[PDB]
């Protein structure tokens, strides 16, 4: 096998295991040392202020199985250190009858068993497991473990009556799934339920949701409440928090609710970040974030969504979360977002970016699959002085509108997402920064214009503000990972309101996905303005392209160009004329980013293994 | 609940857990500290000469499940010490996908992985498991672990290709079972196969049998050979060693071969003990020992059997063991016999004695279930100068006959079993011994005659030689655990050739089994003798009654009298007259025996637990 990246790629399926380990690999983000990873899990801020991040992990394999928690820590979300114990970087693994099929997603009770951080996780055992299969009760249960050494190891409660698993009864029949327990405190929900606690007897200070659905009848998020403060065995089922319809869609701005929820969480935000009021803060908004399955024809049939909700108290002492508006957390190849509280009134969200090799053609040659997104602060985005003539404004699809008293302006509210400032500062400070001259894209603009400074490798960030006429039909954006023969084009088209990533030329290697990514972006036009602005930030990190628009729209995707010189970048322009002009300013190239894993060598492969003929016999894991 | 043993028993099902722990409990034999035990496993003589004994174990439960190896050691088979590690007295437990359903029976490779003692055991996973169910491949596999600290702990090989499990392919389709690997060296089999090794390429110095059968078509013992000396991953299937018919019986002296084998082993014996010749010792005989299932209407549908076999070499380089004669290892409530080699050319066999509470009425009140038999030396029993007029002699049912040259006498050969001399010496030396005067049982003999010295508790041994007329119709034997109201009668009836244990009066507690035990005993009449002798030894140990006749016939059973004074013993006589007389001599009472577990307190209960509602959900174990 040839690794000559100055000529066309050969038959790369002849290459050995992990021979392509460093070729496309992200360097500036959270990723496992090697092998398979998927969903973030067990996220919490430790007593010293550092961040503990777990992830679904299958070392020395490139497909899912024996799923375990791998873990690492960081003081700044950006530079990480692996745990290293008897199971390497793993800290929780299948070990008991109740979890032998996989230690699935879980979340952290900060002050749990004997006061220690405690994880509530989905413990899986034998039987069909999946939204499209006939799953039975017991296959997915919920279990506890706690740590006395701040995440280096976890001790599970014993198996049995009054111990693990702690939640095992299905709250309704014919579930499509029953997993991903999300533990949270909520002054809001406590205040709302305070007059109903004699009906249910549940008076604890922790709530937990479990994600699932009902066969034939749509997804469900089930709400539980800790029965008694300071005690963690008994969790009382209150009722369904979120109920959606079988493949129901709230519209073009909102994905599709599919048939089953995964990795759902509940938070409360205000314009500054996390909100811990009981309802009294009128600027605060209740949100649910959730993945949906089987409501999408591509992207592994998965939508990572969010909804702003209004809580109502039911007669039986439960809560209905009524969806007020509903959006998309990321429009690309990402899923399984988790959020967790951080000091200084923050709620931080992170997801998993899958590869674009769905037929598993070069997975073994990679020697790993998957990475995280960047860590994102959540907040309520507020846009004042919005013009009522903004096209489609009053659909209020993934946003809310509040008219001024005179009816001449609107205040828009939606979910804000922005990369955590610790990462932006570290990235910028460690990079070679080029501040580029502003550019008018007019009749003289080429289709592609390389920046006056170019990246030196596949690790960089771009930023720019694109100013468009209110009635423009021009398109503009950024080309990245570009040589003459390979390139990835990121376009915004204000007339259609579509942000696209065109990947028909992203790689000479034909086995990788090449479908066009698409996100909807609403440019809220400002009263008195004669133009509208798209602020676009793009992170290029090995094969990851992660795009942020206006601290609101995120789109993560993959590009795998073969050629060593497919690293360039510049401006894209289409239909720009003397009359239809696009002004581009605030242009910066951050070349290099940071090495997110300073203790790791470049090649952290430990080889790949096969589980042997018993993998097919047990029928649980692919085995490689 | 009342524990007053001077009055009739109340409703003992009202008693708490382990309140009857010491009431019926053996003291002088191998038994777990508490909870459920079954089959012996992992038996081997350690480097210091001590004996390591494992057993199938489920602590803090009184039914089978999560089956593990519990273990202890002894320098004399008699006084034992528990291992004590992180899992108490357990040393191997379910921990991996391949063995999570249970660590079933296994046997020892004395010089295995890196030269260490190594166990090959049945690792079980999910799915229907049983001879009467539709079991599938993978549910039962065979796996390796080794010990670097002579049995205090075991390290399993890793899961995967070229590692555990090491044997997983079914050698034939539609197996009724696939377990209990028995590893052994055999100069005999090596000599027989030496001209066929180019056909199979299997040239290792270890063989292994796996016990099972084929649905609808009877039991099978499958023979494997280690592929290469010094290497323990590859075991080559040669062919079926023993093939028997669906519920076939060799006759009244031989039990029934049922539908499936369990815990089968292979040995070679001569008149002094174990034989390690290649075929050249003409006094040596090849034997197979094996349990059978579903060929019996009672005794949990289980026969512990043995067969003398003649090996034949097949064209494909495998061995057929042709049954020459076939017997019963124990006629009572015992099963799962294992044998292992011991220094000084010995082969030692031990089994499991189950309780007689098959409806589980007082199991929780006991707080334990099960014990071992005594440890038994195996050898070829030889009886010279046998009269050809011995009734039924030439059926050669569970014995062989060789005529003298003149046809006037016969040499009888069969499987001998006798309690290991270390135990007999320790028992006798620690007991208060009463040597009793010989007794003629004639017209004046009462039905029951108490011995002139009586036991002081439920821990004693009796011995006696009963001399019968050749044409007697009299019956005689021993009554044990006897007061006026409760007693257990052990009768021999030479005319019918039946040894019986009548248990209609064994206990006032009606929930225990009361069926009559029966064994066949052949009294080989000696040329010129005018009488025939039954040598009977009986061990009474809590609730265990273990009977040995003529170093040949064993019968283990249970009696649970309530009354504190139901400990007496004496002679039984029926149909003895002036003309039909039974002479009883060599009479001894050994009162007390030994405390087999000197470091254990009397009550080693640690309470019982329930597995909770998930036990029924997983459907693998009863859960208590
Ligand atoms: C490279 O990694 C693989 C693990 O992915 C190492 O093990 C090999 O794994 C492949 C599957 O990826 C196994 O192939 C399978 O073989 C069976 C038949 O033998 C076939 O039925 C399946 O469809 C599949 O082809 C392969 O047997 C297995 N090889 C082993 C265990 O030796 C492989 O060893 C790694 N290579 C190196 C040099 O480290
Ligand atoms: C005495 O030992 C038992 C374990 O055998 C301890 O746990 C209890 O176990 C029994 C089963 O033996 C459980 O009963 C079951 O309850 C469910 C319904 O609640 C019923 O569906 C079943 O048919 C069966 O009756 C019992 O719940 C369980 N009790 C527990 C966990 O508290 C028992 O605790 C031990 N007692 C003492 C004082 O230690
Ligand atoms: O979310 C939890 O606290 C909230 C977030 C948070 C944080 O990030 C760091 C910190 O210094 C304090 C802190 O107080 C938050 C909080 C504030 C309140 O006013 C309140 O009533 C509440 O229940 C909560 C939480 C979760 C837990 O699982 C837990 O056991 C606990 O004690 C607390
Ligand atoms: O039908 C599947 O299992 C069977 C039905 C079933 C159930 O209804 C409840 C339960 O407690 C266990 C359970 O095991 C069954 C099973 C059947 C088989 O034939 C088999 O090979 C197997 O591994 C197991 C199946 C299908 C699947 O597609 C799948 O991914 C899976 O894990 C399992
Ligand atoms: O906190 C911001 O607004 C406040 C909260 C808020 C809301 O939750 C919903 C809503 O209908 C209106 C609204 O007005 C608030 C506000 C308060 C002020 O004192 C102020 O000067 C202002 O412009 C506004 C904010 C944050 C921003 O990041 C921002 O860009 C902005 O224009 C405003
Ligand atoms: O279940 C069907 O699609 C799923 C539901 C769905 C939706 O509600 C809106 C939407 O924008 C896309 C969409 O894709 C879903 C889907 C799921 C899959 O697993 C899949 O393989 C696929 O092609 C697609 C379906 C039903 C049909 O009746 C049909 O004819 C068809 O081709 C497909
Ligand atoms: O302008 C509104 O029309 C539609 C939405 C829309 C958009 O999202 C983006 C865009 O580039 C153009 C656009 O034109 C749409 C439209 C709808 C019509 O019925 C129509 O005749 C037309 O010319 C054009 C509008 C405004 C609103 O505020 C609103 O609530 C609504 O339902 C609709
Ligand atoms: O885009 C503008 O600057 C460019 C981008 C940029 C930045 O992101 C951060 C920063 O520290 C400095 C900075 O200098 C850039 C720049 C580069 C040149 O070579 C140049 O000639 C120039 O006028 C400028 C801009 C915007 C403005 O709003 C403005 O009024 C102006 O004069 C210029
Ligand atoms: O020897 C270096 O790492 C070791 C090899 C290695 C691997 O093969 C696969 C893998 O999954 C992880 C991995 O970590 C190893 C390692 C071991 C240590 O003791 C250590 O302190 C460390 O940072 C790491 C090294 C070399 C380097 O060149 C380097 O810059 C560095 O930080 C470290
Ligand atoms: O049965 C095994 O040896 C036999 C019994 C035995 C013993 O009890 C103690 C002892 O001092 C030696 C000993 O030699 C036995 C033996 C004798 C031979 O002449 C022979 O050819 C043979 O293979 C064997 C055995 C099993 C094993 O599993 C093993 O790895 C091994 O090395 C040996
Ligand atoms: O039918 C039994 O299992 C089902 C059939 C089956 C198989 O054919 C192969 C296999 O790989 C797994 C497997 O799981 C199946 C299963 C079905 C169920 O409905 C169920 O509740 C369960 O625990 C499991 C069964 C019956 C039994 O009587 C039994 O003791 C047992 O453990 C299992
Ligand atoms: O070793 C015993 O016999 C030897 C072995 C043996 C056999 O295997 C089968 C057989 O057909 C006959 C047979 O004759 C052997 C024998 C050898 C002698 O030197 C001898 O004096 C004798 O009586 C006999 C033995 C052991 C005994 O325990 C015993 O009671 C007894 O009478 C004899
Ligand atoms: O399978 C039947 O018995 C089993 C085989 C068998 C034998 O071969 C000889 C013998 O001495 C006893 C004997 O007991 C077996 C048996 C197994 C059981 O599981 C059981 O519950 C039982 O009563 C007994 C059976 C068949 C029949 O055709 C029948 O009518 C019946 O009542 C029973
Ligand atoms: O004596 C033999 O008869 C039968 C077997 C036998 C036994 O086991 C114990 C017993 O108390 C008595 C007994 O009488 C049986 C017997 C069979 C008959 O056909 C018969 O006419 C008779 O009177 C009585 C005999 C001897 C043998 O040596 C032999 O091989 C055989 O098949 C049979
Ligand atoms: O049964 C016979 O002894 C009795 C049992 C027995 C034993 O088992 C071992 C031992 O060390 C001594 C021993 O003394 C027993 C005995 C007890 C008496 O009270 C007594 O009067 C007597 O003659 C005897 C016997 C057998 C004989 O073969 C014999 O010739 C004889 O005189 C006597
Ligand atoms: O305290 C005694 O044992 C402990 C209690 C106990 C139990 O409750 C349940 C059980 O499964 C085992 C068990 O073993 C315990 C024990 C602990 C030790 O440290 C020790 O050395 C020992 O021999 C044993 C004791 C008392 C006694 O009276 C006695 O004679 C004795 O040997 C030991
Ligand atoms: C990039 O590499 C290719 C092949 O090595 C070459 O054709 C091309 O001219 C190079 N430089 C570019 C596109 O700037
Ligand atoms: C470089 O990145 C590291 C790791 O996140 C960070 O701690 C450091 O401050 C950065 N350097 C700068 C901003 O100069
Ligand atoms: C044994 O105990 C019972 C009841 O306590 C009593 O009736 C009997 O006489 C006692 N002694 C015997 C049988 O020797
Ligand atoms: C060898 O022959 C026997 C008897 O035909 C057969 O049962 C066995 O399976 C054969 N061995 C093989 C196929 O390895
Ligand atoms: C008593 O039994 C112990 C334990 O087996 C044994 O070592 C000792 O020799 C026995 N005492 C005798 C025979 O006097
Ligand atoms: O790895 C299993 C985990 O991944 C998810 O399926 C999301 O893709 C979660 O619902 C689950 O806990
Ligand atoms: O506990 C399981 C073990 O017990 C047996 O069934 C014998 O009764 C063995 O065949 C098996 O290994």
Numbering used by the authors:
A (entry chain A), B (entry chain A): 42 to 665
Per the authors:
Xanthophyllomyces dendrorhous β-fructofuranosidase (Xd-INV, EC 3.2.1.26) is a highly glycosylated dimeric enzyme that belongs to CAZy family GH32 and hydrolyzes sucrose and various fructooligosaccharides (FOS) and fructans releasing fructose. All the polyphenolic compounds are bound by stacking their aromatic rings against Trp105, with additional hydrogen bonds from their OH groups to several residues at the active site directly or through several well-ordered water molecules that are linked to the protein.
First, the epigallocatechin moiety of EGCG is stacked to Trp105, with the OH next to the Fru O2 being linked to Glu334 carboxylates through water molecules, whilst its second hydroxyl is linked to Gln341(OE1) through a water molecule. The triphenyl ring of epigallocatechin is polar linked to the carbonyl of Leu661 at the C-terminus of the chain. On the other hand, conformational changes are not observed in the residues at the active site upon binding of the different compounds, with the only exception of a switch in the Glu334 side-chain found in the crystal containing EGGC, possibly due to the steric hindrance associated to this bulky compound. As can be seen, the positions of catechol and the EGCG diphenolic part of benzopirane are very similar, while the aromatic ring of p-nitrophenol is slightly shifted towards the diethylenglycol trapped in the catechol containing crystals. In contrast, catechol/EGCG binding position is shifted from subsite +1 therefore tolerating binding of sucrose donor to a higher extent. In contrast, catechol, HQ, and EGCG bind at the inulin-type subsite +2, occupying the same position that the terminal glucose from 1-kestose. Furthermore, the significant reduction in hydrolysis rate presented with catechol and EGCG may explain the absence of FOS in the first 30–40 minutes of reaction, after which these molecules allow moderate FOS production.
